[PDB]
């Protein structure tokens, strides 16, 4: 559990090639002398698999993913592979599956096992009286919350140590889809020394384990043999290959045994067989698939750097209004860059409420209302929902869901003179509370008592529009801050100043993905020589195909060229002589994709011969190919 081995030598996992491994029965359908196409997770041919062994310096137990599906293939001679650990996070917090075998019964239990540091099983005292009896149990520590347990039939497995070549071939399929684990197995004797065998075997399922859990990582147990940290192992080999959702073609004989499998995503020869559903390729050009160039990135070309919003008359103005007779200004039909308003280094008060200023870039609003008023330094913090004071209860009250901003600047050399500034006024007395977005411009004399005031001052009759005090003998923070409050809301009107993704992006002569005002598509923007009309924005072909557009805020003449698309034709002779092919893509060029230029595309795979022979397989425009010496 805690004691780990110290004989681990770090070796690089080099790449290994596979020939035809990863073939098994897809479902419970028995077929014979037919050719059916299936869609399931299979091992791709000539892919990249792992390279690990179980030797007495290299003792490696790596952690491999499970979300893509793995394939297991091991060549054994002394029954070294014992079991695997099917878990999610390799801890005692989630539900895991542990399938081991102590050569007596197939132990399949679904519990909450405790993942140890390095589990290992071995045989003790190999000097004398071995008898192949195991006693060490270091696979897991505890097992609780068991919901399923499977006990197989008792048998006797020979775990003797053979020397020389391999005698057993045990392969497994480890995949899980929709909570249904499928386990396959196949055993056959082979002859092998070092490399991977280029054979063919179909795997049959043994049992069905509907665990219904998620498996992300897994390990592999190994057997140990040495004549509690310096123990060694024997000699074995195992390979792990990642599964992919490919398509096979299982060739059934008269008895039902799978004899051939063809992966359609390996070579252009396989594209002819997976299309016509026949391994016997006849003479003639056959269309298999369609080539298409994938786009690189999405580029939106809505805004530009011109046609800015009129913020110069708002932020750099001379005189403003008071807090009771403030003016409401609407700003729309422009583009406002919020990065040049943040790094101006001239605003002494720049606050925002509701949402973050870095999050409103990918967010569209429809109404912008600037509320500019002149207050003191002790009244800026009262512009907040759920507050009291001389502003929120008397002059201006914010609503609850206010997601606006507060923008102001310093007025040390603008509204500060010697003598006193009696320009602005403010209301001091009021009977009731306020409402959101309410303007009060009345000059009614407040009646504090029961006697009327008749518009003049007297007993309990004070002037409500009190004068402000701005003197040079006051504090620094008591200067009149020109507070401009922005308003934002959501209505049925569409958005005006939002910005799609950014300002501008210009990538020419490439297959990119554009985004226009009324149509989308993928094409290449190339040069042109026509003279379009300045008020036009788009342009169509005969049968309604967009091919030439104009930028709305930039006078440019560019067309829309479609990318390199077309069918894929495989030129190959019959399978009775050879298997060489000729890759031919239709409606392509020899630049974007032994290179020969044809009228139908770029032919890569055939050599140019000046000698004219008889036509065997047609290509196009009077060109033929023939498999001759």
């Amino acid at each position, epitope marked *: 559990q805690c004691v780990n081995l110290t004989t681990r030598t770090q070796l690089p996992p080099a790449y290994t090639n596979s020939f035809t491994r990863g073939v098994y029965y897809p479902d419970k359908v028995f077929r014979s002398s037919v050719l059916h196409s299936t869609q399931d997770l299979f091992l791709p041919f000539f892919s990249n698999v792992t390279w690990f062994h179980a030797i007495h310096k290299r003792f490696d137990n790596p952690v491999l993913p499970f979300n893509d599906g793995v394939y297991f293939a091991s060549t054994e001679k002394s029954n070294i592979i014992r079991g695997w650990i099917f878990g999610t996070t390799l801890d005692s917090k989630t539900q895991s599956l542990l399938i081991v075998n102590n050569a007596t019964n197939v132990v399949i239990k679904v519990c909450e096992f405790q993942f140890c540091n390095d589990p290992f099983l071995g045989v003790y005292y190999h000097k004398n009286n071995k008898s192949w009896m195991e006693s060490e149990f270091r696979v897991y520590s505890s097992a609780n919350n068991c919901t399923f347990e499977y006990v197989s039939q008792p048998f006797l497995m020979d775990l003797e140590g053979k020397q020389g070549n391999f005698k057993n071939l045990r392969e497994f399929v480890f995949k899980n889809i929709d909570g249904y684990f499928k386990i396959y197995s196949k055993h056959t004797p082979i002859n092998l020394v070092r490399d991977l065998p280029q054979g063919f075997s179909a795997l049959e399922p043994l049992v069905d384990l509907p665990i219904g859990i998620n498996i992300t990582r897994f390990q592999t147990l190994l057997a140990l043999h040495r004549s509690s940290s310096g123990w060694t192992a024997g000699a074995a080999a195992y390979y792990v290959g990642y599964l992919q959702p490919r398509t096979f073609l299982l060739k059934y004989n008269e008895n039902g045994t799978i004899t051939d499998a063809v992966d359609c995503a390996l070579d252009p020869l396989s594209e002819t067989k997976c299309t016509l559903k026949s391994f016997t390729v006849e003479k003639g050009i056959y269309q298999t698939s369609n080539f298409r160039v994938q786009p690189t990135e999405s580029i939106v070309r809505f805004p530009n750097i011109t046609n800015l919003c009129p913020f110069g008359e708002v932020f750099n103005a001379t005189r403003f209004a008071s807090v009771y007779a403030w003016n409401r200004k609407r700003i729309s039909n422009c583009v406002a860059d919020y990065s040049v308003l*943040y*790094n101006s*280094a001239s*605003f*002494s*008060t*720049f*606050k*925002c*409420y509701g949402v*973050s*200023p*870095t999050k409103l870039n990918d967010l569209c609003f429809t109404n912008v209302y600037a509320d500019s008023f002149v207050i003191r*330094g*002790d009244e*800026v*913090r009262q512009i*907040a929902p759920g*507050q009291t004071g001389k502003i929120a209860d008397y002059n201006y009250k914010l609503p609850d869901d206010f997601t606006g*901003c507060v923008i102001a600047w310093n007025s040390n050399n603008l509204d500060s003179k010697v003598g006193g500034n009696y320009n602005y006024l403010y209301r001091l007395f009021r009977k009731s509370n306020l409402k959101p977005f309410e303007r009060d411009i009345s000059t009614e004399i407040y009646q504090a008592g029961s006697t009327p005031c008749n518009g003049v001052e007297g007993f309990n009759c004070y002037f409500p529009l009190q004068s402000y005090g701005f*003197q040079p*003998t*006051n*504090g*620094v*923070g*008591y200067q009149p801050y020109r507070v401009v409050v922005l308003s934002f809301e959501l209505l049925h009107a569409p958005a005006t100043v939002c910005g799609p993704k950014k300002s501008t992006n210009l990538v020419k002569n490439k297959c990119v993905n554009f985004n226009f005002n009324g149509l989308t598509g993928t094409g290449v923007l190339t040069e042109s020589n026509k003279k379009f009309l300045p008020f036009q924005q788009f342009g169509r072909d005969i049968a309604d195909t967009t091919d030439a557009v104009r930028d709305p805020q930039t006078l440019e003449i560019l067309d829309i060229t479609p990318c390199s698309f077309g069918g894929v034709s495989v030129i190959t002779p019959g399978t009775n002589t050879s298997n060489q092919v000729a890759v031919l893509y239709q409606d392509v060029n020899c630049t974007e994709v032994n290179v020969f230029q044809t009228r139908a595309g770029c032919l890569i795979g055939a050599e140019h011969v000046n000698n004219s022979y008889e036509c065997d397989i047609p290509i196009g425009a009077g060109i033929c190919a023939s498999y001759q010496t």
Partner: antibody
Amino acid sequence: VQLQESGPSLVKPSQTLSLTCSVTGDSITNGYWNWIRKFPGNKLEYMGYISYSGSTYYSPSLKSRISITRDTSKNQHYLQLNSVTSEDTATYYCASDYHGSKYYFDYWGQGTTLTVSS
Amino acid sequence: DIVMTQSHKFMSTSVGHRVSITCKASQDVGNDVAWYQQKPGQSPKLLIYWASTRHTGVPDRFTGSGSGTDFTLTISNVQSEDLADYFCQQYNRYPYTFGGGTKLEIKR
């Protein structure tokens, strides 16, 4: 301008607090005098300030239980914090925030720890 | 109210490494960002004013930048004398709500 804090370090609850932020070296001409307390546990909160004009405003957490007076004769100002609780036990400071020669500066003092307990 | 939220309360910085003290406030404050330097047993002092100019008496190993609500106090050449507490503050308006503070740790 040098700063010095003084006053009693033992304030009974539900009573009137008293402090004296001594200002020596330069008289109150331009600038404010804030009040920053330090709770045990690396948590900070603002209390209030006073100017040389006659306008006093404090934190919104304290509605009307704090009053700061001024005295331009002895260049000192007192801090009256009425109805103190057990959570008001903190280290009280006084500082000043005023620019100089078109550059921002910040002066600080020593500070004293006041314990409010029964 | 102005909520000043930092990244972590306790961090670790060895001698010679570069630590990026980030204080991601929920509300935007503009460019009025100042930082404290509080030794254990003393008063905090001003370090960086207006986020672009160092204070008189402070060496050139203290830099500061940031964009939006994601500020970064890059502390270069972290020595043994720079072990202090940092507090993101603002001189915009009252009350001066301060952050929690980030304490460094030298590994040896």
